[PDB]
RNA sequence: AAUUUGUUACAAUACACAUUUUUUGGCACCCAAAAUAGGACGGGAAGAGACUUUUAAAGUGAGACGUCGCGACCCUCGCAGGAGUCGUUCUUGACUUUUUGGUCGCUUGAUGUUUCUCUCUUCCCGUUC
C-alpha cells in the first residue's frame, strides 16, 4: 500500500515497524545489545564503530568507532588507522554494515 | 578583507558578490540574487574562473602565481546539484 | 526495559578477573567506579576508545589483553586526580600515592 | 522558485547552455518545463572538446543542466522586486 | 503512441527475449525472458545470462535493479 | 593627513570600477586629494578587498612601496603624485597596469627601482617624469622594463623590442 | 525520527565537516538546514597528504581550494583560511564533534 | 560632465583603447564610464567624469594632445549621458 | 507473472546471492527481511569477489541484481 | 508531476546521446513523465556511418536518466 | 483645548520528501622523482647533442579544436543599451524597432585541451641554510 494514503499516526507506526521488524533492525538491534558494528562505505574505507544512534536515512552517530584505509600505487600498499572520539555519519556514504559476534 | 554576520543565512544574505563552488572544479563569482529550496540561485554579472592543469601541478605542495582561466557570462540561473560551497567575496554596492 | 520487579544475575567482574588475580581485580574495579563518576561521559570515549575492543555476549566489561585497561585506569585515576585535585586546588606535582589513595579510599 | 520563473521569463530570447558532460548549446529557447528541461531552436553546439556543429531543434533534460545564461536585461524584471 | 512501460508489458506477455545494456561503469550486458517490473523499471529476468564487454555464465531467475539499466533492447 | 587604517574604513568603496573587476578604493575622505605625505603605510587595513584598482592620484606619496601582499590588485592610478623610486617585492606577481604620470621619477632611480624582471606588469606609462626626457630613454625604459606591453601609451615596437632584446643581450 | 534535528543542537561548537571531496573543515558551527545545509564561521578547511611515495591528491579538491580565494600564498602545504562558508547537505560525508559534548542528553 | 573625444588613431583596438583613455583621464579625476556605449571608433569615446570640474580640467589639458599618433580633439558633449 | 516485490517475498529464507555494483562482489546467504525500498538482511553470508560473515544489512542504492 | 512536451516530435527519427559515450538514432515512439523514451527500429552510431553501425531491435525503451540530450533530424 | 491596543489581508523564516529531473551519492584507482653536513630551488638568455625540412645548409618532441590578440595593399564619417507613441503634468507608466567591428595573414600571436615516445654546458636575477 502505497504511503500517500496512510495518515500522520500510521507513518509514524510504519517507521516503528520498519526498525523494529526489518532490515535496519540489524542495526537497532546492535544498538541496544551494545554489539560493535563494522562499516564499508562507499569510499572503500572501513570503520569500527558502536552506534549511539541511527535513522531512517542509515545515516547514523557513532562513538569511539575506529576508522581503516589502505592506500596502494603501482602495487605498494600501506595500512593507516584514525581514531576519532565522536563521530556523525551521513547515511549516502555506506553500503555494507555487518554485526559482530 | 570582509566579515560577514556573525550569523547569517543564504536569505540574509542578498546582492551580495558571492564566489561559488562546484563539483567540477570551477568557480562563479557574482551578486547573488535569488535562490531556492534546494539552492539553486541566480548570479547577476557572473565570471566563471578555472584552474590550468599545469598551474593545479603548481598547486600541489612543495609564493605561487596561478594564471586562472575565466570567462565572463551574465545573469545566469545555477544547478543546485552542481553547487558545493559559497563564500562570500564582497558587500553590497 | 523492566516494568516488574524482579532478581537478576549478571558480573561486575566479566573478563579482568578472570584474567587477573582476585585482590587487584578488585582494585581495578574500584579504581573503575570512582572513575565513571569523573567520566561524565569520555567513559564510552575511553572504554570504547579502542574499537577493536567488543563486550562479550554473557559480560558486562569490554573484554581485551588488558594493557590499554591498566592505561584506561590511569587516565581515569588522572580524571579523577585533577576533579578531587581542582576543588581543593593542588598541583599534580604535589599529589603523592598517600593522597592518590586518600583519592581512591577516602 | 525564482529561478525557474526567470527561466520561463527568457522564453523567445537566445540562451546559453551548459551540460554536466562539457558540451555547449547556444540558441533561442522556445520550451521550458518546471523540471528545468528546455528546448531549444535554431542551436549552435560546442562539443567538450570544441568540435562546433549546428542543429535546428534540440531538447535537453534538465538534470543534465549545469548553468543557463539568460539575457542580462531580465536582471530588472518584476520577479526580482 | 506506446508508451515506454506500456512496451515493457509488450515484452512480459509476449515472451519475446530481450538484450538489457547497464551502466558503462560495470561492463556486463544481460539477456533473458522479462517477467514482470515495477513502477521503478526493476524487473525480473528468466533465464537471464551476463555477458561481459558469449562465453558468459548463466545467471537464472534473477530481480534486477532499475537504477543500473539503460537500454532494454529485442 | 597621514594614510591610516581608520581613514581606509571610512574610504567609499561603494561604487566599483566597471572597465575590469570590482570596489575600486579611494583612500581617506578621498584618495583624489588626499595629501598622503608619507609613503602608503596601513596597507592592512584593506587586506586586498578587490583587476582591482587603487585609485591615488593627486597625493603627496614619494615612494611605490610598504605595500602588504595583494592578490586581487591590477590597476594602479599614481597620477599627480611625488614618486621618486617605487622599488618592492610585494606587488610582484600581482598587477596588470601601472600610471605614473606628473610624478618625480628619475630616469635612472625608476630603472634601478624594478631591478628587471622575467615578466611584469603589462599596462605602463610613465609620462610627465624628469627621465622620459633624458636621451635614449625610451630604448633605456624598455631596457629596464624587460617584457613590455606599452610604453606611454606607445606600445615598444616589435622591432624595437627586438633591437631592446639585443641591446640586454 | 530524523536525525538531522541532532545537529541542529550542535550550534557554536567546534567541528570538522569532512566532505566527499575529502576536504576536511575545521569550524565553528551555526544553524544547521532540515537538507543538512552546514553553515560555519571561522573555518581553516583543507586536504590531507596522502604519503604514500607522494601519491597525487584530489586534482578537483586543489582547484575548488585555491578557488575559494582564502588560500594564502605563502601556505607550503595545502590549505585554506576563511570566514564564512556555507556547505550544501549533499557534499557532507562525516561530522567529527567535539569529546566534550554528552549524547545522553543531546540524543533525546 | 562627459566630453566628446573625436580625431584618434583607429587601428588600435576597442578594449585597449578604452583602457588607454581611463588611464590618461584618471589624473583630473575619477572616470566613470571606461568607454563610450557606441563604440564606433576612429575617435568618437565620450569620457564620462564624476566630477564636471575635472571634465573641465581634462577639456583644458588634454586639447589637441598626442595619442597613438594623431592629437586629439577634446570637446563638451551635447547631450548629457544615460549614467549620469 | 511475478513482479519484483512478491519475487522478494517469496525469496525470504531461501539462500540468495546478491550482486552490488562495484567490483562484482556478490554476498551468498540467507535472506532475512527486506525494507521498501529493498534493503536487505542476510544471515551466513559469505563474501565473494572468500570469507565467511555472520550477520549483513545491505543498502538499496549498492545491490545490482539479487538471485537464488 | 508534469509530463514533458516530445508532443511535435514522436514519428519522426531522432538522435539522442545515450550517457557520454553513446548516441542511438531512431523513430520515437512513445515516452512518459521520467522521459523514458521508447522508438523502433533503433541503430547505434559510430564514427564509421555505414560499418560499425549496427542495429539494436525492433523495439527499443531507453531509460530516462541516461538522456542527455535529444536532437531530431527531421521536420 | 504622532504614540498605544484590537481585527483583516499579503510577504519572509521553522514544524517536510532515501526509488530515473536537483539534499541520504556511479563511490574510489592511473603509476613513478631530493637528502646532505660552498650547497640547492625558480625565472630569463646563449651554445651543443638528439629531433624535423630541402638538395652541406637552416630553428626545439610531434599531430589535432578553439581563445582573445601583432600586421593590413581593405571597408568605413564622423557627438548620439537605449529610442519612439499615448496617457499624464514639469519627467513617470503601457505599447512597437531592433552590435562595430564586417574580414584576411601571423615570415612561427601568444595561449589551454587531448594521444603517442624517451638532456648537458655558460652567464645574469631572486629565495634558503
Known amino acids: 500500500r502505497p504511503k500517500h494514503e496512510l495518515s500522520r499516526a500510521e507513518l509514524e507506526e510504519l517507521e516503528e515497524f520498519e526498525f523494529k521488524h526489518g532490515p535496519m533492525s540489524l542495526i537497532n538491534d546492535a544498538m541496544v545489545t551494545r554489539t560493535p558494528v563494522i562499516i564499508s562505505l562507499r569510499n572503500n574505507h572501513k570503520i569500527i564503530a558502536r552506534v549511539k544512534a541511527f535513522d531512517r536515512h542509515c545515516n547514523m552517530v557513532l562513538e569511539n568507532v575506529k576508522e581503516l584505509w589502505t592506500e596502494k600505487k603501482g602495487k605498494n600498499v600501506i595500512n593507516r588507522e584514525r581514531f576519532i572520539s565522536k563521530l556523525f555519519l551521513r547515511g549516502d556514504s555506506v553500503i555494507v554494515v555487518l554485526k559482530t559476534p | 578583507k570582509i566579515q560577514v554576520a556573525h550569523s547569517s543565512r543564504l536569505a540574509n544574505l542578498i546582492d551580495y558578490k558571492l564566489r561559488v563552488l562546484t563539483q567540477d572544479g570551477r568557480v562563479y563569482i557574482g551578486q547573488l540574487m535569488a535562490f531556492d529550496k534546494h539552492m539553486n540561485l541566480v548570479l547577476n554579472e557572473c565570471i566563471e574562473e578555472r584552474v590550468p592543469k599545469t598551474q593545479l601541478d603548481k598547486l600541489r605542495p612543495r609564493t605561487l602565481n596561478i594564471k586562472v582561466e575565466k570567462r565572463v557570462l551574465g545573469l545566469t540561473i545555477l544547478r543546485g546539484e552542481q553547487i558545493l560551497s559559497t563564500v562570500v567575496e564582497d558587500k553590497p554596492l | 526495559k523492566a516494568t516488574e520487579p524482579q532478581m537478576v544475575l549478571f558480573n561486575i567482574y566479566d573478563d579482568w578477573l578472570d584474567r587477573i588475580s582476585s585482590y587487584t581485580a578488585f582494585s581495578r574495579l574500584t579504581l573503575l567506579l570512582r572513575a565513571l563518576k569523573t567520566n561524565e561521559e569520555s567513559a564510552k570515549m575511553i572504554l570504547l576508545s579502542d574499537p577493536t575492543i567488543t563486550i562479550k555476549s554473557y559480560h558486562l566489561w569490554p573484554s581485551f589483553t588488558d594493557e590499554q585497561w591498566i592505561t584506561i585506569e590511569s587516565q581515569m585515576r588522572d580524571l579523577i586526580l585533577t576533579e578531587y585535585g581542582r576543588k581543593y586546588n593542588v598541583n599534580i606535582s604535589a599529589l603523592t600515592q598517600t593522597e592518590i589513595k586518600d583519592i581512591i579510599l577516602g | 522558485g525564482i529561478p525557474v520563473k526567470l527561466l520561463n521569463e527568457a522564453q523567445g530570447h537566445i540562451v546559453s547552455l551548459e551540460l554536466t558532460t562539457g558540451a555547449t548549446y547556444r540558441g533561442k529557447l522556445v520550451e521550458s518545463e518546471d523540471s528545468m528541461n528546455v528546448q531549444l531552436r535554431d542551436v549552435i553546439a560546442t562539443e567538450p572538446q570544441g568540435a562546433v556543429t549546428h542543429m535546428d531543434q534540440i531538447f535537453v533534460r534538465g538534470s543534465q543542466i549545469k548553468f543557463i545564461v539568460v539575457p542580462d536585461l531580465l536582471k530588472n524584471a518584476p520577479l526580482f522586486k | 503512441m506506446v508508451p515506454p512501460i506500456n512496451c515493457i508489458f509488450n515484452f512480459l506477455q509476449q515472451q519475446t527475449p530481450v538484450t538489457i545494456w547497464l551502466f558503462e561503469q560495470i561492463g556486463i550486458r544481460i539477456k533473458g525472458k522479462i517477467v514482470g517490473f515495477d513502477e521503478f523499471m526493476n524487473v525480473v529476468i528468466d533465464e537471464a545470462v551476463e555477458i561481459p564487454v558469449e562465453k558468459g555464465t548463466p545467471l537464472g531467475k534473477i530481480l534486477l535493479k532499475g537504477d543500473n539499466i539503460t537500454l532494454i533492447t529485442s | 593627513m597621514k594614510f591610516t587604517p581608520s581613514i581606509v574604513i571610512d574610504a567609499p568603496q561603494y561604487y566599483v570600477d566597471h572597465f575590469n573587476g570590482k570596489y575600486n578604493v579611494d583612500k581617506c575622505v578621498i584618495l583624489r586629494d588626499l ?75 625608476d630603472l634601478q627601482r624594478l631591478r628587471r624582471a622575467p615578466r611584469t606588469l603589462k599596462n605602463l606609462t610613465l609620462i610627465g617624469n624628469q627621465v622620459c626626457h633624458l636621451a635614449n630613454y625610451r630604448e633605456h625604459v624598455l631596457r629596464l622594463v624587460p617584457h613590455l606591453e606599452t610604453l606611454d601609451f606607445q606600445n615598444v615596437t616589435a622591432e624595437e623590442r627586438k633591437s631592446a632584446m639585443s641591446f640586454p643581450r | 525520527m530524523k536525525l538531522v534535528n541532532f545537529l541542529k543542537k550542535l550550534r557554536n561548537e567546534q567541528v570538522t565537516i569532512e566532505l566527499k571531496n575529502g576536504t576536511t573543515v575545521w569550524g565553528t558551527l551555526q544553524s544547521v538546514s532540515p537538507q543538512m545545509n552546514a553553515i560555519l564561521t571561522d573555518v581553516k578547511l583543507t586536504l590531507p597528504q596522502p604519503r604514500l611515495n607522494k601519491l597525487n591528491s584530489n586534482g578537483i579538491a586543489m582547484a575548488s581550494l585555491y578557488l575559494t580565494g582564502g588560500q594564502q600564498p605563502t601556505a607550503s602545504d595545502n590549505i585554506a583560511s576563511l570566514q564564512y562558508i556555507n556547505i550544501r547537505g549533499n557534499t557532507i560525508r562525516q561530522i567529527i564533534l567535539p569529546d566534550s559534548l554528552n549524547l545522553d542528553s543531546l540524543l533525546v | 560632465n562627459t566630453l566628446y573625444v573625436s580625431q584618434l588613431n583607429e587601428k588600435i583596438n576597442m578594449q585597449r583603447l578604452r583602457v588607454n583613455l581611463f588611464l590618461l583621464f584618471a589624473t583630473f579625476g575619477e572616470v566613470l564610464k571606461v568607454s563610450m556605449n557606441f563604440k564606433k571608433q576612429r575617435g568618437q569615446a565620450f569620457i564620462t567624469m564624476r566630477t564636471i570640474d575635472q571634465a573641465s580640467l581634462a577639456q583644458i589639458s588634454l586639447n589637441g594632445e598626442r595619442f597613438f599618433g594623431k592629437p586629439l580633439k577634446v570637446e563638451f558633449s551635447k547631450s548629457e549621458t544615460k549614467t549620469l | 507473472p511475478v513482479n519484483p516485490k512478491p519475487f522478494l517475498k517469496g525469496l525470504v529464507n531461501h539462500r540468495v546471492g546478491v550482486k552490488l555494483k562495484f567490483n562484482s562482489t556478490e554476498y551468498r546467504g540467507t535472506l532475512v527481511s527486506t525494507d521498501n525500498y529493498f534493503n536487505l538482511q542476510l544471515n551466513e553470508a559469505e563474501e565473494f569477489v572468500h570469507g565467511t560473515l555472520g550477520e549483513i544489512f545491505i543498502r538499496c542504492n549498492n545491490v545490482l541484481y539479487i538471485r537464488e | 508531476v508534469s509530463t514533458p512536451e516530445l508532443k511535435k516530435y514522436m514519428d519522426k527519427k531522432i538522435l539522442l546521446n545515450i550517457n557520454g559515450s553513446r548516441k542511438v538514432a531512431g523513430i520515437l515512439r512513445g515516452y512518459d513523465i521520467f522521459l523514458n523514451v521508447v522508438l523502433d527500429d533503433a541503430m547505434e552510431i559510430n564514427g564509421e556511418d555505414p560499418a560499425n553501425n549496427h542495429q539494436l531491435g525492433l523495439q527499443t525503451v531507453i531509460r530516462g536518466n541516461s538522456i542527455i540530450s535529444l536532437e531530431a533530424l527531421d521536420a
Open chain 6, 35 to 109: 595629501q598622503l605625505e608619507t609613503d602608503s603605510e596601513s596597507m592592512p587595513s584593506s587586506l586586498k578587498h578587490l583587476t582591482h584598482i587603487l585609485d591615488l592620484t593627486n597625493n603627496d606619496l614619494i615612494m611605490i612601496p610598504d605595500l602588504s601582499r595583494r592578490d586581487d590588485i591590477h590597476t594602479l592610478l599614481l597620477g599627480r603624485n611625488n614618486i621618486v623610486e617605487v622599488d618592492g617585492r610585494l606587488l610582484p606577481m600581482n598587477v596588470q597596469n601601472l600610471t605614473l604620470s606628473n610624478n618625480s621619477i628619475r630616469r635612472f632611480e
